[PDB]
A = this chain, B = another copy of it.
């Protein structure tokens, strides 16, 4: 795969690494563990959004884009 692709695929690959964990349910979990698992969801969500934002920043830099392809 080309470098431009390597970066464009980041947000999705990360989507994949994480979808299983934050796709599981903890309806029976106690209030204190429910809060901790919710904190995990927030942590993953923020890592997901950050990478996503980072890549959008990278692909809006005409310089970075030019290099990634020629």
A residues in contact (CB < 8 Å) with B: 1, 3, 6-7, 9-10, 13-14, 16-18, 20-21, 24, 26, 29-30, 32-33, 36-37, 39-40, 43-44, 47, 50-51, 54-55, 58, 61, 63-64, 67
Contacts and interface: CB of A to CB of B under 8 A. Distances in A.
A65 B25 CA distance: 15
21 contacts: A1-B20, A3-B24, A10-B44, A13-B17, A13-B18, A13-B20, A14-B18, A14-B47, A17-B17, A33-B63, A33-B64, A33-B67, A36-B58, A36-B61, A36-B64, A37-B58, A40-B54, A40-B58, A43-B50, A43-B51, A47-B47
Contacts of A10: 17-18, 21, 44
